[PDB]
Symmetry: C3
């Protein structure tokens, strides 16, 4: 189009010492809420830091001016109790005058804090100040649901070991995953029963797309990718594990379930009593 959109966000400290972003005070989540826009759109985010330490929003991929980089160095962070408007722009792909192709902002991206604990946001990220951003290209396939999976150090979504998260679908649902990594460690994301293309959308464009089809992918801090799968396609219903495949990581609890249900709402072998 594109559209000018406006949005409020808050950073807040949670009772247990974690920190989260939210669209409303008292409704902070880890990961933070999904921001989704179309190439061309501009997003003005009125950000309020409700915490007692400085905090910021820094985003990957999108077009922001230096005044919205979220760093102390560029005076782009937010004092305790303060408010700042960050502007994220996006563009559509197209040919420059030099004849090269400007790529477009479309992709799976993310936002996170850049000043809590250290000037690279090490404490903020660790505490939960991260969330996903999706930029869609005109004509991209849209899913029934999007789930965000973040490997943050040795946790998934800052959860305790062996507590998921778990996600549920029914055979045939189009499910989108946004997969983000943060912290200190490399990981390998693996899903049982499902595969995707290692390219922008996770979907091959057709028979001439030579991208590798995979079910396992090495990631490190601040990597983001995403894909769509048809739940149970060619494989049926089941409690399908996803996990980090680094062996000590899966053993120490970086595992969850993709619960793909039959049309009767049950998972083979785990029917309700």
């Amino acid at each position: 189009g594109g559209e000018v959109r406006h949005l409020k966000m808050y950073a807040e400290k949670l009772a247990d010492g974690q920190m989260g972003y939210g669209f409303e005070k008292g409704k902070a989540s880890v990961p933070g809420p999904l921001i989704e826009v179309n190439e061309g759109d501009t997003l003005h985010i009125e950000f309020t830091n409700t915490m007692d330490v400085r905090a910021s929003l820094h985003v990957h991929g999108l077009d922001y001016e230096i005044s919205s980089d979220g760093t102390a160095m560029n005076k782009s962070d937010v004092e305790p109790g303060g408010t700042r408007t960050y502007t994220w722009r996006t563009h559509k792909p197209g040919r420059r005058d030099d004849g090269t192709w400007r790529p477009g902002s479309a992709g799976y991206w993310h936002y996170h804090d850049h000043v809590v604990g250290t000037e690279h946001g090490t404490g903020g990220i660790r505490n939960g100040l991260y969330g996903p951003v999706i930029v869609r290209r005109k004509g991209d396939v849209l899913p029934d649901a999007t789930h965000t999976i973040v490997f943050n150090d040795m946790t998934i979504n800052n959860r305790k070991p062996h507590t998921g998260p778990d996600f549920e679908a029914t055979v045939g649902d189009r499910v989108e995953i946004v997969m983000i990594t943060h912290g200190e460690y490399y990981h390998t994301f693996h899903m049982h029963g499902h595969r995707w293309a290692d390219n922008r959308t996770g979907i091959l464009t057709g028979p001439d797309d030579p991208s590798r089809v995979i079910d396992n992918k090495i990631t490190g801090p601040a990597d983001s990718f995403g894909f769509q799968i048809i739940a149970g396609e060619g494989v049926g219903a089941g409690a399908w594990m996803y996990h980090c495949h680094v062996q000590s990581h899966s053993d120490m609890g970086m595992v969850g379930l993709f619960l793909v249900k039959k049309p009767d709402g049950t998972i083979p072998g785990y029917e309700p009593h």
Copy 2:
């Protein structure tokens, strides 16, 4: 086509404490033997666990039902002395009704144990219960030979440091490599004298394939890729090293040789006496 194929496999403990898969009892190898099929084919594997601990077969990439996921959770592992038939299916690529492209099973994949030592197969994998699977697309180029190189923790194919393995070819042979990683560590696979495309087949489709041409690739646990090279192409005969390029890893013995011979059967500088 595709074809329904049947096959027997065994897991067995080896005299030195390692564990291996094989197509015949007493002929277990590490890595396990190569399974190769075409997109469309179904493979029914009659698996017998000859060991005194529970064991399983779990596969990447291929279409299996939950009853063949190889996990304790889905009652898909095999008691000591028991037998179970695992079914792996594959599909061809093509357009779904939703207009998106279903990708096909073609690729370089692998199988491994999922219950020895831990419920993620940490002990089994460590002991040698891993092997390669290749799914071919109609029209894929076939090689003269396929070699499997597995970086398993700080070993290549569970070998002692500085003992290879070494592989031999003659200048002009079409050689296929299946490269799998397991365990705890990230690695970088490097081959001297030879390069490949970072895509599904390791071969560029033509002048419009923008995939990076590389000779060095970061991998982590459960990653698999593969490629074909023409031995000695543009570079001639030689003892061409391959190794992990992580410096302490190569120094500690993650090195072997790709011995590419002249038509007289010799390697420059290392002629037999």
Copy 3:
């Protein structure tokens, strides 16, 4: 064409104990100087080892015979004070008789020592014996400037923590980055304000190129990639950070600046007094 080119290079020890390559004695740098050629060209490098320990030149990607592999094993290293001519060839892409596509040498590559400290060049690499090589395809877009960024263990270009390097551009400059990793650690390279395509050239070929557009990329020892960006495109002037995104690495000093200036030569918020 291609062209036969000749060049002199030296390895030398620097007063502080580091080691560097150069085109002239007394002008060694870390990283070493950029070698750039076109597909088809042959480069004969007359290399002199001025140091008191054996040293070599080993290159990635390019077509070299075994006598130019730079290893002790193939008698391809250079005694103290000695001279050796290494030959690097390159080829253009095209169809083989077997109907497959030979890929071409084009890409972002690198050279480094293979015998100082260990027979994998661990000491040489650590001390600074590394540099970039670019092979261009006919018709590739050429930049205004090329900068080389090497993550060598926990340093950028062997620099002390928090000392850059910094690079400067003006809004609208076409800037090329060659990004190389060495040593023991995995890293994630991230640039604020700028993005590129994860493919050979870092530039999408057009609307049908499905390569992921990224601003963050995991790398390990001996990985090389490169890309071109338009400085400030869609984002304007600024002190744009680049850094490793592994959180302890950025905190410990793996950070520098891409200083993109307005047409008046200033950086927003950091104008000269």
